[PDB]
Structures are given as structure tokens and as C-alpha cells.
Design a protein around this nucleic acid. Structure first.
Ligand SMILES: O=P(O)(O)O[C@H]1[C@H](OP(=O)(O)O)[C@@H](OP(=O)(O)O)[C@H](OP(=O)(O)O)[C@@H](OP(=O)(O)O)[C@H]1OP(=O)(O)O
Ligand SMILES: O=P(O)(O)O[C@H]1[C@H](OP(=O)(O)O)[C@@H](OP(=O)(O)O)[C@H](OP(=O)(O)O)[C@@H](OP(=O)(O)O)[C@H]1OP(=O)(O)O
Ligand SMILES: [Zn+2]
Ligand SMILES: [Zn+2]
Lengths: 396, 397
RNA sequence: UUCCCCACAUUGACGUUCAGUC
RNA sequence: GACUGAACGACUAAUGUGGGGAA
């Protein structure tokens, strides 16, 4: 009973185990193609993640959208005030950023010519802005349970026998947790007071990054498109979360949504999303050797993968990633001009510095507050953000 | 890196920048060792180390380590003292300056203690009145990392967006005033539309605001390191040098220390915007991530051992007041004020014998303070935050 | 069930050494 | 120098199991 798939909604559109095994095969497969059958230099991974899109029930109408690896976060000294760094390179966190490029691309594809609109996954929304066509779903694959609430208790395979949580009501369950710089495990936020500072970090204060478990729970409320893309499009959710290993149904479902079911007063179109949760039929084996300092990423359409030094947030020659704040902002800005102002979901105008533009997404920003509040009232801690200095930059 | 190179001073150049830096860097750290049974003591665990070195002449070994201190945290708001027994700010460099104040009081006492001792005192009578420094004495500030606040806000693994010298095509003006956040080693900008702190208000739990060291040192580079009370006896003293053991970026530091308020006008006589020598050291400390110790060490030449203060409370572990608190400093000043004949005061002892009122006796210093506050507002850099006026109304014995 | 105490385990940095690539 | 791959040591602050308690 512990390691069994957890169905999603009220009308069931795919077979659970078939999908899980499908997306694990597809992503792990496409990761093979990118690495000349795992023989490549940067093919050594510790954790693998990816996003799969589906257009319909035919499980060969599936497309691998993104593939990524990584287990590390940026060093404190290497934070970039020009937004050129990858602050978090845990596999699944990167696949979401990889997904963002594909969404921007799809927006670009729509506003190119009327003949190309039919090829784009987006369409106009009666409410203003853009929405997905009625049959598009996205699915998250992680080769292992996400760090934090889904993985911290029992980081090892269940021994089945439905070895449910013998102590499900400890204060420590459902707690928000942060990756800590220069230390292992993931730690509660309560016991580590909040509000980070730029200079505080530069001095030696350990950089705190939210756990992947908490980040996805977040994706299950404000959606995966994030603030900037939410100005163009309506909130998008993962339909499924598939784990290639370390699956504990009870733990993952708490961490992914159950713990914030107290959330109220979400803005229109926003909701607490409860995706399909599942392990795969043949769980992945634990990967050999020391864990690599680099984090790989790819998005469908790309000619090559990108290899990032997780320590620094840049590549080997010190170049900014295609996934960093500064690039994503550039894509956003380029599309913002190609989109007519009667077609925006939010018409509030702000200067063109990063933090300020994110603030134009009032509803998304609102949803976030409902989310932070949910965790707090549940006694699960206050969310921890990067120093406010991190997002104060323009496009040169 | 053009970025990691010394910026010579607009003061007196008596030593070579780089020889001097490595000199005071090596001494303070050496003297911090001696105080801690060679770094083996419990209290040798620091995050930040600071110190003051004095020089008497051009020979670069005629130096004396005057003060040594450690600390990265501030008092908790709830724990402030209405009788001035608490140390509101225990940051390494802030603490070094207060210890230096003690060295200043001792040297004044030394002068008016014995006629023979006057030749041993760093002070001399001044023709303009009161006391002034001997014609070659300089003080040098060492900090093991760039001071918190504006001087530290930047990416140390990226080139500088050199401000295009032709009206920022967007908008700019960095250098904004920033405040230490209570229960943290860090800093946040000041609300450009803010409130003012109140005594009963903070004590309940409202944010205590203490200005960042970057903003404090800039203040030292205008009104001097001697503070208000001591300016009644002696003339303004400035650091000739500021040496950094890490996170040194010349253009950033020069900004935070003086360049951002170069718009300063109508300073009183003897007061000026001091532009000291800025420099890093050759073998920089590496960033050591981990907890910042909750305690603050301090020492002043003449002392037998160090004093250790709980930064959160501003007192020591047994709740005894530090030698650096307002009340202690007042005790030293009052001792001197009676030993000094009234024609020799730089301002007339007019006002009553409560702390705040005596600070107002320093008219030229107070004036200097106001021009400084005004420099920051007109520069579009935020308004300075002063503690509620209750902090400073208390008396002695 | 929850917490406490003690013991034993589990899970990103640092240092030492060894092997290679540009 | 940077990156890469194996060994050993020592840190990190949560978390697990057990024994004993407690509500
Ligand atoms: O995918 P991630 O690596 O976790 O990045 C996110 C993302 O920031 P960027 O897209 O700008 O990198 C969030 O932005 P949204 O698009 O979700 O709005 C931002 O959220 P805020 O808007 O709340 O700043 C959050 O940062 P924070 O730590 O401040 O929540 C930050 O995650 P990291 O900073 O942990 O990478
Ligand atoms: O070394 P610091 O901890 O920064 O102390 C200073 C110092 O006060 P004390 O010497 O009495 O401790 C200033 O005094 P002067 O420079 O005038 O001698 C004072 O400024 P004012 O006395 O002019 O108000 C200021 O306090 P404020 O917060 O009011 O600026 C205060 O700084 P802290 O309050 O951070 O100690
Ligand atoms: Zn993770
Ligand atoms: Zn400071």
C-alpha cells in the first residue's frame, strides 16, 4: 500500500503505471541520445530529471521536452547581481527552467504568422492572454524523490510490506526545509530564522535554498510558468510526478500537496493542483561514484546540451546559462513587444528591471502570498527568499 | 585585475600603500593571536576581525596595535538599555573604534597627569585651542573583510558595470544607506519613505535599525573617529588608512567611504571629507561559510586581557556592562573634564550633566553631523536613522 | 500517539593523497 | 591553472532506529 500510484482527478485519461513507465523510458531514453548512449563526458549523473508533454491518449503522441541532471547549488561568492548565475541546479529544478524556454518558444511560434498558430500549443483565452490547447499535459520525471519532505524521512527504498509512516504526526513532518550551503541534509526554516542578506552571505552566512519538495508544492499552487510568463499565459500545472526511485506514496503526497490543503482565497484560475503521483515498474539503481559538480540541461529543439558548473552557476568558460534570470528575461522582453497590449493578462506597467517586472503579475504574486500563508498557518515555517538585491538589474 | 589595486590617499603619504597594508594586517592578526593563547582560546573563533594601528613616524615598524576586536552581530531591540549600559552595535570595526576612544581618553589623562608625561602623550596643546595630534601621528583601520553595507554589495566574480559616466541610460545611484537587520549579520536598504524608531515601540519587538558599518565609516570620514564628547577636548581625528583582509574592490570601497557623499558642503573649520588610503592585502582571507559566533571580543592597549560581550544583549555573559558602553565612556570623559581647566575646552561646558545634553555641547561636531545627513538626502541615498532620544538621557554615579 | 534522554546509524562542503584531460 | 575520476580523513544539522523515560 505504501509504494502504489495515487490517481489524480475525477475523470481518468491515461493508465497510471503505463504512463509512469512511459515517461521514465522516454526521458531516460532521450538522455541517452544526447550522450551517445551514456558514453559521453558529461553523461555521468547522480540525479536525472525531465519533463514530458502529451497531446493525447496515444502514448506515442508523447514528446520529451526537457532533460537535466544535477545535485548541487551555487556557492555564496558566485551569486550574480546581473542575474547570470544558476542559483539552484538540482535536476528537477533545472528541467522546469528548461520547460520555460519551450513555453517562450511556443509563444514566439504563435505570434509568427497565422499559418504557424496551428502548430503552437497555445491559443487565445476569452479571459485575455493565452492558454494551452485543451489536450496538452505536462509530466515531471525525477530519477529519485525530491529533497525535503518527500525524501528526508526514509531516503532509502521502501521494503514494501506497505511500511507506512509509523510516526506520521511528528512536528517535523510537512515542514518547509532548505538546502544549506556547505552542509548536508535539508533543514527546517523555523529553527533557522529568516531573511537572508547579500553581504551577510558574501561574508560567510550560509546560503539557504528551498528544498525541491517545497518548490514543487509551490508549483502545485502558482503553476510552473512562474511570474513573468504568467503575464502572457494562464497558470499551467504538471499533470503527473513520476519518481524513478525512492518512492514513498504517503511521504510524496504530503510533501506535494496534502500539507497545504488549508490554502484559501486563491486568485482566479489558480488552485491547489493534485497531480498523479507514481513510482515506476523497474526502479532505477543508485548511481556509482562521487557526485559530479556539473549540471546538464537540454530543451527540445536544441542542437546540444548545456553543461553548467553548479558551484558557480556558469559554464566552463564563465559564460551565462541559457536558463539564468538574465536570458529568461531577455526572451520575455522580446516576446513582450511582439504581443499587443490588448492581449496581455496583466496590463499594469512597471520599469524594466527584473524584480519590478515580476511584480506586474499581481494575481501570480497574490497566489504566492496565499501559498506562503498556507505553510505558515499549517505551522510548517516561513518561506525563505534570496536577498532582495538578487533581482535588481535591467537588460544592460 | 584593475579592480584589486590600492587607491592612494588624499591624506599624508608616509608609507607605501602596499607595505603599510601588509604591516597593519600582520600586526593586528598577530596581536589577536597573543590575546587568545595563539588562537587556541574559545574566543579566538571569529568571522570578522578588526583593529586599529597607530604610527608615530615614517619608519614602518614604529607601529603600535592600539585595538583588536571581533564581531558580526547587533543588540536585540528588546534588550536595549535606558541607562546606556548596552552596546547597540558589536560589529568588529565599530567595536575597534570605541576601544580607540579609550586609548584617546588615557592619552589625554597622560598629558594633564604629569608635566614630564606630556612628552609621552600623543596629544599636544593646540594654538587653535584644545588639543590636537602630534605632527606625525596617524591611525590605521584594519577590517578582515569589507565593511557591511554599501561596500560589500556586489558580485566578487564579475567585472564592474563602470557607470557610463554619461548619465546612466536607465537610472542609477548606488551607495544607498543600508541598515543592519536585527538578529542577522547582514544589511537591507533604508525605506525611502519610512517611519522613525520609538523607545517603547522597539522594546516590544518592532525592528531595531542600526546603520551599516559602511555608512558609519563614511560618517567617520566626515565628523572623524573621535565622536561628539571627545571633540570637546580635542580636534577631529581621521583614519589615514582602511585596509581590507577580503572582498576588496577599489571602486566599490572608494564609493562607500567618501565618493558617494562628495556633494558635501559647508563643513565647519577643521572638518573635511577624509579620503584615506584604501587597500587589500596580498594574502586575503578566504570566505569560510558557517555560523557567525554570537560573541564579540575587544581589547585596547594597556589592557591585561580581552573583554567578551554577548552581541545580542550588548553585555557580557554574566550581564555585566562592557568597558565600551555609553556609560563607561561617559565615566572616562567626566573624569577628564574635571582634570581639564575651563579655558582649554574647545566648547564651553554649558549644558547639564546628562549624556545627550553633553553631546550637544559639541556644536561644530553636531553641525558636521547635520551636513552629513544632508549630503546623503540630497545625494538621493536615504535618510539617516538615529536612535530614539531616550537612549541618550541618563546620568552618572 | 507525541515528546524527552542516551546510544547507534543515515545524508553538501573542506583537507590529504593518487590518476588523468585541456 | 582549470576541469575530470578514485581513496582516505575530518566537518556540517537535520533526520532514522533502538533502549530507557514522560504526557
Ligand atoms: O526555478 P528556480 O531556480 O527555483 O528559480 C526561482 C524563480 O526565479 P527565476 O525564475 O527569476 O530564476 C522564482 O521566480 P518566479 O518566476 O517563480 O516568480 C523566484 O521567486 P520570487 O519571484 O519569489 O523571487 C525564486 O526565488 P526565491 O528564493 O526568492 O523564492 C527562484 O528560486 P531560487 O532563488 O531559490 O533559485
Ligand atoms: O559606535 P556606535 O555604536 O555606532 O555609536 C554611535 C555613537 O553613540 P555613542 O558613542 O554614544 O555610543 C554616536 O554618537 P556620536 O558620534 O554623536 O558621539 C551616535 O550618534 P548621535 O549620538 O549623534 O545620535 C549613534 O547613535 P544614533 O543611532 O543616534 O546615530 C551611535 O550609533 P548606534 O546607535 O548604532 O550605537
Ligand atoms: Zn533537491
Ligand atoms: Zn558591519
Amino acid at each position: 500500500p505504501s509504494r502504489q500510484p495515487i490517481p489524480s482527478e475525477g475523470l481518468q485519461l491515461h493508465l497510471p503505471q503505463v504512463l509512469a513507465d512511459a515517461v521514465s523510458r522516454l526521458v531516460l531514453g532521450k538522455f541517452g541520445d544526447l550522450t551517445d548512449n551514456f558514453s559521453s563526458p558529461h553523461a555521468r549523473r547522480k540525479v536525472l530529471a525531465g519533463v514530458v508533454m502529451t497531446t493525447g491518449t496515444d502514448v506515442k503522441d508523447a514528446k520529451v521536452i526537457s532533460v537535466s541532471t544535477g545535485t548541487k547549488c551555487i556557492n555564496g561568492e558566485y551569486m550574480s547581481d546581473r542575474g547570470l548565475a544558476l542559483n539552484d541546479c538540482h535536476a528537477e529544478i533545472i528541467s522546469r527552467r528548461s520547460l520555460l524556454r519551450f513555453l517562450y518558444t511556443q509563444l514566439e511560434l504563435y505570434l509568427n504568422n497565422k499559418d504557424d498558430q496551428k502548430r503552437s500549443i497555445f491559443q487565445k483565452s476569452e479571459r485575455g492572454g493565452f492558454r494551452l490547447k485543451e489536450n496538452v499535459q505536462f509530466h515531471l520525471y525525477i530519477s529519485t524523490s525530491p529533497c525535503g519532505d518527500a525524501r528526508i524521512f526514509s531516503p532509502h527504498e521502501p521494503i514494501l510490506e506497505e511500511p507506512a509512516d509509523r510516526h506520521p504526526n511528528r512536528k517535523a513532518r510537512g515542514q518547509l526545509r532548505t538546502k544549506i550551503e556547505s552542509g548536508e541534509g535539508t533543514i527546517p526554516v523555523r529553527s533557522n530564522a529568516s531573511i537572508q542578506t547579500w553581504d551577510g552571505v558574501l561574508q560567510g552566512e550560509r546560503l539557504l535554498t528551498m528544498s525541491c519538495s517545497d518548490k514543487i508544492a509551490r508549483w502545485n499552487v502558482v503553476g510552473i510558468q512562474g511570474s513573468l510568463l504568467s503575464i502572457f499565459v494562464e497558470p499551467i500545472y504538471f499533470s503527473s510526478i513520476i519518481l524513478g526511485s525512492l518512492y514513498h506514496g504517503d511521504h510524496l503526497s504530503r510533501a506535494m500537496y496534502q500539507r497545504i490543503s488549508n490554502i484559501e482565497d486563491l486568485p482566479p484560475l489558480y488552485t491547489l493542483n493534485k497531480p498523479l503521483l507514481s513510482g515506476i515498474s523497474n526502479a532505477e539503481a543508485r548511481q556509482p561514484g562521487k557526485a559530479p559538480n556539473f549540471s546538464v540541461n537540454w530543451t527540445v529543439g536544441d542542437s546540444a546540451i548545456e553543461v553548467i558548473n553548479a558551484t558557480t552557476g556558469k559554464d566552463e568558460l564563465g559564460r551565462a546559462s541559457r536558463l539564468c534570470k538574465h536570458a529568461l528575461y531577455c526572451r520575455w522582453m522580446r516576446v513582450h513587444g511582439k504581443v499587443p497590449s490588448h492581449l496581455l493578462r496583466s496590463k499594469i506597467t512597471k520599469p524594466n528591471v527584473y524584480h519590478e517586472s515580476k511584480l506586474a503579475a499581481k494575481e501570480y504574486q497574490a497566489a504566492k502570498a496565499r501559498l506562503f500563508t498556507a505553510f505558515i498557518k499549517a505551522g510548517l515555517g516561513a518561506w525563505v527568499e534570496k536577498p532582495t538585491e538578487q533581482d535588481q538589474f535591467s537588460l544592460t
